[PDB]
Amino acid sequence: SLPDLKIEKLDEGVYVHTSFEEVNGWGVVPKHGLVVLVNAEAYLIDTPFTAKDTEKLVTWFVERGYKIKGSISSHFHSDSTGGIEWLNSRSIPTYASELTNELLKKDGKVQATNSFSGVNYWLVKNKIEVFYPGPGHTPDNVVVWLPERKILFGGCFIKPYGLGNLGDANIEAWPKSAKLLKSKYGKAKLVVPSHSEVGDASLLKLTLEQAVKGLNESK
Numbered sequence: 001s002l003p004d005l006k007i008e009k010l011d012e013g014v015y016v017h018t019s020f021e022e023v024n025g026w027g028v029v030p031k032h033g034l035v036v037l038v039n040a041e042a043y044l045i046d047t048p049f050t051a052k053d054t055e056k057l058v059t060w061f062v063e064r065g066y067k068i069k070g071s072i073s074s075h076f077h078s079d080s081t082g083g084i085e086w087l088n089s090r091s092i093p094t095y096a097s098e099l100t101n102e103l104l105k106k107d108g109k110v111q112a113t114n115s116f117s118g119v120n121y122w123l124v125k126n127k128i129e130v131f132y133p134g135p136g137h138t139p140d141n142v143v144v145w146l147p148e149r150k151i152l153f154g155g156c157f158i159k160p161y162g163l164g165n166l167g168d169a170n171i172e173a174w175p176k177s178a179k180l181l182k183s184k185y186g187k188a189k190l191v192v193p194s195h196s197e198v199g200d201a202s203l204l205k206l207t208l209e210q211a212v213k214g215l216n217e218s219k
């Protein structure tokens with residue numbers, strides 16, 4: 001059996017959720033997202049892989065008196081978006097980029113109910129920022145910045161030890177995108193990847209290195 005959903009406190013008002021899925025050719029894959037609390041309201045930064053774990057995650061916070069105000073998905077793959085359909089059935093607002101929703105639609109998947117377009121977007125003004133660094137892991141991948149805590153959720157874009165599945169990646173653009181990300185958040189206290197442990201801003205440097213290598217390798 002797969003490991004259970006985990007929820008762990010990372011900082012004041014910031015929790016990491018980890019869910020697990022068997023993915024062909026990789027075996028058991030962990031996926032980290034966040035829950036961010038603003039007063040008595042909770043925001044999901046990426047859904048778990050499944051509806052089941054999305055329900056478990058929501059239930060946990062609601063039973064502790066936090067109202068789920070919305071989710072945002074950092075890219076179209078189902079490790080960030082698998083719970084959108086269940087959230088929509090419960091009338092909890094879901095958010096994704098215009099490009100992410102276009103890629104969901106193209107793949108015949110449920111879309112987020114709200115979309116945003118542009119390089120920067122405030123999900124919650126002065127608290128939860130979204131930034132598009134450019135194509136990398138996928139054409140649509142965005143990151144989420146919490147300015148009060150100096151925490152960056154890098155999602156599946158942050159790849160310190162190797163780039164992973166390149167099926168939907170843009171390996172030519174990833175170094176440029178990673179350099180932009182490094183330049184913007186070099187002062188981050190914590191960087192949270194989807195698929196490896198939380199670190200500091202060096203994860204931005206290591207990601208840039210791994211992208212520059214992959215592009216070289218591909219020739």
Ligand SMILES: CCOC(=O)[C@]1(CS)N[C@@H](C(=O)O)C(C)(C)S1
Nearest residue numbers: 023026029077078079156164165
């Ligand atoms: C169905 C689950 O979603 C996937 O298939 C992912 C989405 S990031 N793709 C893989 C990759 O990039 O190698 C992975 C192992 C990082 S998980």
Ligand SMILES: [Zn+2]
Nearest residue numbers: 075077137156
């Ligand atoms: Zn992905």
Ligand SMILES: [Zn+2]
Nearest residue numbers: 077079156194
């Ligand atoms: Zn992923």
